[PDB]
């Protein structure tokens, strides 16, 4: 697929600008990756754009670039809405929604927002309720898995405690 | 306030994703 090798080029350019502090270049490449996924229409392209959003949000947070992180969260919302308009498959919308909810939850665990980590787990449980599929709860447990993992390596004890609770809630 | 803006946008983007999903279903 030639659509994939386009997002990799804009990913190298977006993560490079996230380190040197070129927040304006981050806005351009993130908006470009949105246009790449918007033109094709396939779920894989809408998905592959989320990796770029998650990739730049990691390096921007690791470099103290707070505004570049806020730009990634904005794009993560835009790919979801652009998918709800393009994608006709309701199950593909569920996957892309939890994949975006998972991204905003990993950045909140590093940032130790606690309240945002709680809302992310609260939203992720709600998305899997209307879906009612075994695929939805599998990805919902993955948002809890990533929140608990990232919060441990960060030493934020408030999130690993909330993650273990939400995991036990849907086990029944 | 810069970190408060980061957390505030996280809550908003999350509730917008949930809102758009409850409308399609």
Residue numbers in the entry:
A (entry chain A): 2 to 173
B (entry chain B): 179 to 203
The study reports:
To generate a second conformation, a copy of the parent protein is rotated around a “pivot helix” and a new backbone conformation is then created by combining the first half of the original protein (domain 1), the second half of the copy (domain 2), and either the helix following the pivot helix from the original protein or the helix preceding the pivot helix from the rotated copy (“peptide”). Using a combination of Rosetta two-state design (see methods section for details) and proteinMPNN(27) with linked residue identities, a single amino acid sequence is generated that is compatible with the state X hinge as well as with the state Y hinge-peptide complex. For design cs207, crystals were obtained from two separate crystallization screens: one screen for the hinge alone, and one screen for the hinge in complex with the target peptide. In the absence of peptide the experimental structure agrees well with the state X design model, and the structure of the hinge-peptide complex agrees well with the state Y design model.
We set out to design proteins that can switch between two well-defined and fully structured conformations. We reasoned that these goals could be collectively achieved with a “hinge”-like design in which two rigid domains move relative to each other while remaining individually folded. The hinge amplifies small local structural and chemical changes to achieve large global changes while the chemical environment for most residues remains similar throughout the conformational change, avoiding the need for global unfolding. Designing one of the resulting conformations to bind to a target effector couples the conformational equilibrium with target binding.
